[PDB]
Design a protein around this motif. Sequence first.
Motif, PDB file in Angstrom:
ATOM      1  N   UNK E 204      -3.706   0.951   4.411  1.00  0.00           N
ATOM      2  CA  UNK E 204      -3.064   1.720   5.463  1.00  0.00           C
ATOM      3  C   UNK E 204      -1.559   1.808   5.296  1.00  0.00           C
ATOM      4  N   UNK E 205      -0.922   0.694   4.921  1.00  0.00           N
ATOM      5  CA  UNK E 205       0.513   0.726   4.662  1.00  0.00           C
ATOM      6  C   UNK E 205       0.848   1.610   3.481  1.00  0.00           C
ATOM      7  N   UNK E 206       0.064   1.527   2.411  1.00  0.00           N
ATOM      8  CA  UNK E 206       0.428   2.271   1.217  1.00  0.00           C
ATOM      9  C   UNK E 206       0.234   3.758   1.411  1.00  0.00           C
ATOM     10  N   UNK E 207      -0.792   4.132   2.159  1.00  0.00           N
ATOM     11  CA  UNK E 207      -1.039   5.543   2.384  1.00  0.00           C
ATOM     12  C   UNK E 207      -0.053   6.124   3.383  1.00  0.00           C
ATOM     13  N   UNK E 208       0.271   5.394   4.441  1.00  0.00           N
ATOM     14  CA  UNK E 208       1.103   5.976   5.479  1.00  0.00           C
ATOM     15  C   UNK E 208       2.552   5.557   5.394  1.00  0.00           C
ATOM     16  N   UNK E 209       2.911   4.786   4.383  1.00  0.00           N
ATOM     17  CA  UNK E 209       4.300   4.470   4.123  1.00  0.00           C
ATOM     18  C   UNK E 209       4.620   4.783   2.674  1.00  0.00           C
ATOM     19  N   UNK E 210       3.880   4.177   1.743  1.00  0.00           N
ATOM     20  CA  UNK E 210       4.405   4.128   0.387  1.00  0.00           C
ATOM     21  C   UNK E 210       4.146   5.424  -0.358  1.00  0.00           C
ATOM     22  N   UNK E 211       2.982   6.038  -0.147  1.00  0.00           N
ATOM     23  CA  UNK E 211       2.693   7.321  -0.788  1.00  0.00           C
ATOM     24  C   UNK E 211       3.660   8.443  -0.421  1.00  0.00           C
ATOM     25  N   UNK E 212       4.039   8.674   0.847  1.00  0.00           N
ATOM     26  CA  UNK E 212       5.062   9.704   1.061  1.00  0.00           C
ATOM     27  C   UNK E 212       6.431   9.290   0.566  1.00  0.00           C
ATOM     28  N   UNK E 258     -15.617  13.124   0.587  1.00  0.00           N
ATOM     29  CA  UNK E 258     -14.540  12.322   0.033  1.00  0.00           C
ATOM     30  C   UNK E 258     -13.939  12.940  -1.215  1.00  0.00           C
ATOM     31  N   UNK E 259     -14.461  14.080  -1.665  1.00  0.00           N
ATOM     32  CA  UNK E 259     -13.754  14.888  -2.646  1.00  0.00           C
ATOM     33  C   UNK E 259     -12.414  15.366  -2.107  1.00  0.00           C
ATOM     34  N   UNK E 260     -12.313  15.544  -0.789  1.00  0.00           N
ATOM     35  CA  UNK E 260     -11.105  16.073  -0.181  1.00  0.00           C
ATOM     36  C   UNK E 260      -9.948  15.095  -0.222  1.00  0.00           C
ATOM     37  N   UNK E 261     -10.212  13.797  -0.332  1.00  0.00           N
ATOM     38  CA  UNK E 261      -9.154  12.802  -0.404  1.00  0.00           C
ATOM     39  C   UNK E 261      -8.696  12.537  -1.822  1.00  0.00           C
ATOM     40  N   UNK E 262      -8.874  13.498  -2.725  1.00  0.00           N
ATOM     41  CA  UNK E 262      -8.407  13.326  -4.091  1.00  0.00           C
ATOM     42  C   UNK E 262      -6.891  13.334  -4.187  1.00  0.00           C
ATOM     43  N   UNK E 263      -6.204  13.903  -3.199  1.00  0.00           N
ATOM     44  CA  UNK E 263      -4.748  13.885  -3.198  1.00  0.00           C
ATOM     45  C   UNK E 263      -4.222  12.499  -2.868  1.00  0.00           C
ATOM     46  N   UNK E 264      -4.751  11.894  -1.807  1.00  0.00           N
ATOM     47  CA  UNK E 264      -4.298  10.574  -1.388  1.00  0.00           C
ATOM     48  C   UNK E 264      -4.763   9.519  -2.377  1.00  0.00           C
ATOM     49  N   UNK E 265      -6.045   9.542  -2.703  1.00  0.00           N
ATOM     50  CA  UNK E 265      -6.700   8.497  -3.464  1.00  0.00           C
ATOM     51  C   UNK E 265      -7.224   9.104  -4.749  1.00  0.00           C
ATOM     52  N   UNK E 266      -6.993   8.439  -5.869  1.00  0.00           N
ATOM     53  CA  UNK E 266      -7.537   8.933  -7.119  1.00  0.00           C
ATOM     54  C   UNK E 266      -7.799   7.760  -8.041  1.00  0.00           C
ATOM     55  N   UNK E 267      -8.350   8.070  -9.206  1.00  0.00           N
ATOM     56  CA  UNK E 267      -8.641   7.087 -10.235  1.00  0.00           C
ATOM     57  C   UNK E 267      -7.979   7.639 -11.487  1.00  0.00           C
ATOM     58  N   UNK E 268      -6.698   7.343 -11.678  1.00  0.00           N
ATOM     59  CA  UNK E 268      -6.009   7.781 -12.883  1.00  0.00           C
ATOM     60  C   UNK E 268      -5.747   6.643 -13.852  1.00  0.00           C
ATOM     61  N   UNK E 279       0.502   4.411 -10.486  1.00  0.00           N
ATOM     62  CA  UNK E 279       0.382   5.444  -9.473  1.00  0.00           C
ATOM     63  C   UNK E 279      -0.063   4.801  -8.172  1.00  0.00           C
ATOM     64  N   UNK E 280       0.715   4.978  -7.107  1.00  0.00           N
ATOM     65  CA  UNK E 280       0.334   4.353  -5.848  1.00  0.00           C
ATOM     66  C   UNK E 280      -0.853   5.029  -5.187  1.00  0.00           C
ATOM     67  N   UNK E 283      -3.298   2.758  -6.492  1.00  0.00           N
ATOM     68  CA  UNK E 283      -3.201   1.429  -5.909  1.00  0.00           C
ATOM     69  C   UNK E 283      -3.735   1.429  -4.484  1.00  0.00           C
ATOM     70  N   UNK E 284      -3.524   2.513  -3.744  1.00  0.00           N
ATOM     71  CA  UNK E 284      -4.067   2.586  -2.396  1.00  0.00           C
ATOM     72  C   UNK E 284      -5.576   2.764  -2.422  1.00  0.00           C
ATOM     73  N   UNK E 285      -6.062   3.605  -3.337  1.00  0.00           N
ATOM     74  CA  UNK E 285      -7.497   3.742  -3.574  1.00  0.00           C
ATOM     75  C   UNK E 285      -8.100   2.417  -3.993  1.00  0.00           C
ATOM     76  N   UNK E 286      -7.337   1.660  -4.769  1.00  0.00           N
ATOM     77  CA  UNK E 286      -7.749   0.345  -5.216  1.00  0.00           C
ATOM     78  C   UNK E 286      -7.925  -0.616  -4.056  1.00  0.00           C
ATOM     79  N   UNK E 287      -6.960  -0.656  -3.146  1.00  0.00           N
ATOM     80  CA  UNK E 287      -7.117  -1.547  -2.009  1.00  0.00           C
ATOM     81  C   UNK E 287      -8.179  -1.087  -1.036  1.00  0.00           C
ATOM     82  N   UNK E 288      -8.494   0.205  -0.991  1.00  0.00           N
ATOM     83  CA  UNK E 288      -9.711   0.578  -0.284  1.00  0.00           C
ATOM     84  C   UNK E 288     -10.957   0.070  -0.981  1.00  0.00           C
TER      85      UNK E 288
END
Lengths: 61, 83, 73, 27, 741, 38, 154, 119, 80, 31
Positions: E204-212, E258-268, E279-280, E283-288
């Motif tokens: 939650x922190x990484x998506x709503x703080x660190x990613x933007x 969950x195809x739609x969350x490819x912008x927020x979360x990915x596997x690169x 890539x954060x 990392x956010x996808x990772x912590x999910x």
Amino acid sequence: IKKGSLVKILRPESFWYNEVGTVVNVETSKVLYPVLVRFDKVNYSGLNSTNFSLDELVEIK
Amino acid sequence: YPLNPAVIFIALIGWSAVAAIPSNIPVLGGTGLTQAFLASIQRLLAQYPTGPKLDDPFWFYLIVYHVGLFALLIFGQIGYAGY
Amino acid sequence: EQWVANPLKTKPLAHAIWDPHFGQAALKAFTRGDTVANISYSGVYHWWYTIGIRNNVELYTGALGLLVLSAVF
Amino acid sequence: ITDNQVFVALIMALVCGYLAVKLAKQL
Amino acid sequence: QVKVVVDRDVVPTSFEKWAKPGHFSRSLAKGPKTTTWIWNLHADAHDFDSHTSSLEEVSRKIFSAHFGQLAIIFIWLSGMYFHGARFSNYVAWLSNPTGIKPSAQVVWPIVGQQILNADVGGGMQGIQITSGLFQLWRASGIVNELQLYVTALGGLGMAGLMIFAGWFHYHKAAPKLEWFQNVESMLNHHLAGLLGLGSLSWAGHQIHVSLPINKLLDAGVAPSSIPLPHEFILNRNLMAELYPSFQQGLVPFFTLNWKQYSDILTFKGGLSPVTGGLWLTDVAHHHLAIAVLFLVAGHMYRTNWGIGHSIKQILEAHKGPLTGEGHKGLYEILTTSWHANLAINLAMLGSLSIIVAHHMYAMPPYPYLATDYPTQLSLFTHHMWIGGFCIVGAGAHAAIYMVRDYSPTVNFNNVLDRMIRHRDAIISHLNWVCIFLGMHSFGLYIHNDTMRALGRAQDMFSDTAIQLQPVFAQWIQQIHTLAPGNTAVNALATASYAFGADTVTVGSKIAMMPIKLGTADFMVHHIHAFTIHVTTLILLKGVLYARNSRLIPDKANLGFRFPCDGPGRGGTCQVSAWDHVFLGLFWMYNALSIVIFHFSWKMQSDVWGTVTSNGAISHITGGNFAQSAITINGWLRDFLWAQASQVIQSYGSSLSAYGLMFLGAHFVWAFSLMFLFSGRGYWQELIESIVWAHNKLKVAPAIAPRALSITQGRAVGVAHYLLGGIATTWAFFLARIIAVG
Amino acid sequence: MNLKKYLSTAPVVATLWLFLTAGILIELNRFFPDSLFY
Amino acid sequence: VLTPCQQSEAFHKREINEVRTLENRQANYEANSPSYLALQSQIDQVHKRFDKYGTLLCGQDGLPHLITDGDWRHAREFTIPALLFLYITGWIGWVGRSYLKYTKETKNPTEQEIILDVPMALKYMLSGFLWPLSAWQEYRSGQLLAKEDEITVS
Amino acid sequence: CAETEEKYAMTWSSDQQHIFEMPTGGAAVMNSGDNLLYLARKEQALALATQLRTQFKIQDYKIYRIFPSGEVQYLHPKDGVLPYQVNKGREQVGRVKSTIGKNVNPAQVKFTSKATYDR
Amino acid sequence: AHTVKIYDNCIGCTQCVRACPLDVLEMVPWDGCKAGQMASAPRTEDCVGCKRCETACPTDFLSIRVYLGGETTRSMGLAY
Amino acid sequence: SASYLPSILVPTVGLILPFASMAILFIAIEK
Ligand code: CLA
Ligand code: CLA
Ligand code: CLA
Ligand code: CLA
Ligand code: CLA
Ligand SMILES: CC1=C(C/C=C(\C)CCC[C@H](C)CCC[C@H](C)CCCC(C)C)C(=O)c2ccccc2C1=O
Ligand code: SF4
Ligand code: SF4
């Protein structure tokens, strides 16, 4: 000789050689080391109370 | 202690046939998991000193085949725990 | 005695080497003349040069002169 | 600087070796 | 069953027992007739399993002491956030990270030591950070100093909650043992509540703080036009421009689109070539993934609702025929003794810390972390050494369980003591593996040492000589090159650039280069296998021979920290289970000294350094590993002599404190040896010959001045060997790479 | 009452005193730095 | 040869080297920077540091050597901090001796050295100021020394 | 081994099948009625005697010292009596007239085959 | 063998015999002390010489002294 | 200068003398 007397020792292998100490026990029952004497400071075994004969037993006044 | 050393070969069909017909295309094997190995051993079997570290379908399907084959024969000996 | 000729220039050589382990490149790092010897860093040629030994012959007669003395002891 | 004196040397210390084993097997 | 049974108002909170030092042990409240009472005051100060056998009172003491530890950790982290706030150049560092060297601590101006204030840019000087906190903060998204002051303030607030917490849990609400041996619930709340909600809320922190924020800093915006992290949650319109998947809300989550969350979360995978870190999004996808996977993992332990396991019915069902009884007994072993749990948790904690070290050099997870190499170096190094010591604590506390809390009645024919039935066949094959690896890991270095010294360089183990190319590491490393298309199907780049493609250059500085492993790296891996097997030999010898050896058949009666038995059996000095831990600390210093010397010299020859135009390559040592790691003259010359040049020439400059922590840490190292080699039968009447010189002047101390005891007098030798020896490499490393990186 | 008895122990007095003499030297070396005379 | 230090040339070369070398760090900051002000105070702490060594003897190295003969032309180098220092540790030694010969006769002397009687401790802490003529008056009294204490065999 | 070294055979009896701990290591079954135990060296055996006796009543126990010629000995117990308990049958050997304080100096024992305490 | 000699400080408090894990030391009734006891060391052929007696010998200085003598099979205490 | 003599004496004293001298000393333990 008597109980409670402050006694310096004259046996060179004691930890308390040439240090005065208080007599706890004097036994009159033919024991070779009848006089149980304890001290202020303590040897390596954690044991101040030892015992002695009469020749190694010098009182003061 | 090894009270029941009955059969081994039942694991082989138990491990080849569970990986042959699943193709799962975009990996190393465009065909199945075992066809990409048994097809890739007969090119090298007749005394070939080739097969370097870049030989993907032989060396990778050595370990990824034997690490399930070992586990399924060990579980074949666990298939004599209920006896 | 070659050291006696130029005691500043030439290095005092110790005993020679026999390694069977010096393959090829080691031997080029030890040749001083025909010898491959060590360099005698023990001051011995200086003391034997102030004694008055100016030959190898006196060193042989002295070496026999101390084998005899060790046989005496 | 010669060779024969080296032979004479190892003769004399070979004899000295016989005194070494000679002293060695008595103490 | 499960319930909470807590005693209230247990221990009074007076200062009365502070006036009785050594109140805690009935063997120690006699008062000091000797000075060995002093030191035994401290070694018995945390023998909680040796104050009183009552496990309730022990368990209250430890569980309240944990909050003291977390109190010191929150004081420490609040210290780091406040030194980042008040003292650091972090706001200036956030402008250009590749130019400004990170510094917090600004040395007070007294005599000379103002020269330690390194002009690190940012318009302000001070001694340079190598702990890499700023790279953790840019990943966190901390923009200006106010979040560092506020987070330091909350660090003090949590420190107050831990002080008041432990005070509250020893004195005026302290639980029963029935609360402590509720281990299905303890795992059920740590696997889910601690780790699960920790990783989920951190996602939650990484998506709503660190990613933007680390999208805006990846664009290169200065930290003034960046809005607050705060200001991304009030409206999605500041995030829908950055990631348009926020416009759809949580509707594609609950509809499983969950195809739609490819912008927020990915596997690169790979590394972001702008910031040099992970890539954060990954990392956010990772912590999910840790979130759902650990929150699933928590619910395998039946507590109240008859749903889940107990540990007992799991362990009893593994009754395999080569062990006979199976694991019948371990749930009574691991829920009555704390040293056993400390052995397991220290072993896995330390090995996790080593895993942390490797995963921080080769997949640098923070932005601009692999571009300032000291923070890249020492965060590898430091998590190795706590990664090391915590293993030896395993070998301590698996020994202590074998000495103190072992019980053959509960522990009869199971998996545990059936080892001890053939501990000669354990230690004998560790003995064989240690000698085999020692010959074949170090005799190769004496071999290449002589062959290079004998001139015959054809007979070495070089690249050109008899090659020993590590076949398996190159092969599975090539599998990791072939990861992101073949088997990691939905990947894009590899798992790391320590495996596969071309290197990552971030600001003319090499983030990660594909490490080649050839015929020298082989032999250093057999060093590491060797010195891991020797510590495993000493720390399995210290556990299997902890209790009843065939030399001394009563060590359980003698204890754990006994020095010896005596001169009998030809001498039995240094024979206790403690003494093998004493040796495992030296071999810890060996094994990790060559782990980091393998690190800091292969990654100054094969990874780090700078690049010039046309993609040209320039390492720090310049490729000087594989021709030089094969000997020891190449090792000692080309690494411990050549890399000293930026430590030893450091006087007059800002690195000179390291030049003081280089010499003095030699000192302490050699000062250890006085405690190691000598013994107290010398020092006791050397001291007593000085006690003559005090009795002559009536300066006789009332507390009688003994020498140190034997186990103390060697324990202090370890504890100076490691502080001196470790701080040499500490000042040598940080003095080396700060002068370059 | 007994708090001062804790503040009278060996390490606490040794830190309240060596902290004080260390403060004498550090405060006496800011005020008079580089004192090689006298 | 011990030149007087104010006119040694290589000494003044160390002055130019440390002022200018320290001034190389001063070429980074603006006129109102607190760092720059700190290097102003630091340059003050170099010129004062070198002018206050005007009566030492810096030899051929330009480094101020000392003298320990008590020449009375160099007494401010060594012998005046010698007398000062021996006063301070004659204080400390006398305080420690007086406090131990207090607590040697108490109730529990073992407890008295853990937990210092700050009453009697800070009695002796201050009371050991006149220790030359207190040790000289206890030494004439036959009380400073001792006799027939512990010894080993022979 | 048993071909050339003394194997110590601790024999004892009990009342209940408890569980003791071997000096080899690991738990043992502890036959309830009567049981022997071949061991290696004496400290293992009397360490087992302390292992049992400090726990509970295990008495009428003693090792027969199997030496490889074949016969036995009687260690521990020796005299149906516990060794720190006083029996009036043990004849003392290993004493001198006084303390260390009257031991002769080893420069008097020098070049003689005596000991520094013999007087 | 390790010659164990028991001097006349031995007041017969039996921490030697209870401390020795080898039964080399017993107690002998000796009418010279208050307790009437004085230890003896008959079976010094089994004596390891670990000096665990001299730890727990609460006399003035060590009534029981363990002189390190010869080293046989048993006195070396080797397992095999 | 008999240059061939180290090629005889350095092996026959360097290796085979601490073979047969190991035999003489080690059997001489049991003689
Ligand atoms: C899901 C709930 C939960 C959470 C989050 C934790 C978290 C923790 N427990 Mg814990 N525990 C729980 C339930 C939980 N426990 C239960 C149910 C039991 C009984 C079986 C235990 C028994 C237990 C023991 C015996 C020990 C811990 C310890 C710890 C700490 C490990 C150190 C660490 O990771 O530092 C990371 C630190 C943090 C993440 C800080 C978290 C602190 C915040 C405020 C959350 C704490 C929630 C707290 C339980 C609320 C109290 C409720 C009360 C007001 C009614 C960690 C704080 C160990 C320790 O160090 O003691 C403190 C320890 O020895 N726990
Ligand atoms: C540099 C010093 C040094 C060296 C070489 C060793 C070496 C060794 N230690 Mg060690 N140790 C040391 C310091 C050292 N230690 C210190 C300071 C401590 C203090 C804590 C310890 C504590 C310690 C413990 C606690 C243990 C060891 C063990 C071992 C052995 C591990 C097995 C092995 O590597 O075999 C290979 C041998 C080597 C690598 C040595 C070099 C041999 C070369 C390669 C070949 C032989 C040379 C040559 C051919 C000889 C023949 C010629 C000659 C006869 C003329 C090994 C012999 C373990 C042990 O005893 O059993 C495994 C063990 O348990 N050590
Ligand atoms: C222990 C590490 C090690 C290893 C692997 C080697 C290896 C080698 N050294 Mg060497 N060396 C070492 C340490 C080592 N050295 C050290 C420590 C020193 C200095 C003291 C030297 C000094 C040295 C010199 C001076 C020279 C060498 C040379 C050599 C080479 C030839 C030697 C030879 O004939 O092998 C001997 C091998 C054997 C007799 C065979 C025994 C080993 C076998 C394979 C074990 C097999 C067991 C088997 C697996 C059991 C399972 C099967 C069973 C169940 C049926 C060889 C590459 C020579 C060379 O020229 O190099 C090219 C040379 O001149 N070495
Ligand atoms: C798909 C979700 C996801 C994503 C995006 C990531 C992303 C990342 N992980 Mg990862 N991880 C995941 C799931 C994920 N992880 C899971 C489920 C686990 C537990 C098994 C881990 C365990 C893990 C570790 C231990 C580490 C990372 C690390 C990393 C980072 C390195 C970059 C990289 O190439 O890693 C790509 C990530 C992977 C290739 C991991 C794939 C894991 C799969 C999904 C496990 C599936 C488990 C499932 C039950 C099947 C098991 C059988 C299977 C092994 C065949 C990256 C941010 C490293 C790190 O900290 O960076 C510094 C690191 O050290 N991860
Ligand atoms: C009570 C204070 C006191 C006094 C008066 C002395 C006096 C003496 N000691 Mg000393 N000593 C002391 C404490 C003291 N000691 C302590 C606490 C230790 C342990 C570190 C030692 C360790 C020691 C050694 C190892 C040696 C002496 C020696 C000596 C004699 C030579 C002077 C010297 O070099 O001192 C030595 C001074 C030190 C080693 C350091 C100073 C000791 C402390 C830090 C200073 C005193 C402060 C004290 C704690 C104050 C307590 C009282 C206060 C709380 C009220 C001298 C008689 C030497 C000797 O026999 O010469 C004849 C010798 O070899 N001492
Ligand atoms: C030096 C040494 C000692 C002597 C160490 C002495 C006893 C300790 C010295 C340090 C103590 C802490 C000094 C005491 C000082 C007090 C703290 C009071 C001083 C005043 C202030 C510092 C507070 C041993 O006892 C020993 C034992 C076993 C093996 C090796 C050794 C060994 O090498
Ligand atoms: S000597 Fe010491 S130990 Fe032996 S009996 Fe007399 S008192 Fe007990
Ligand atoms: S010598 Fe060792 S074994 Fe014999 S008694 Fe004294 S301590 Fe026990």
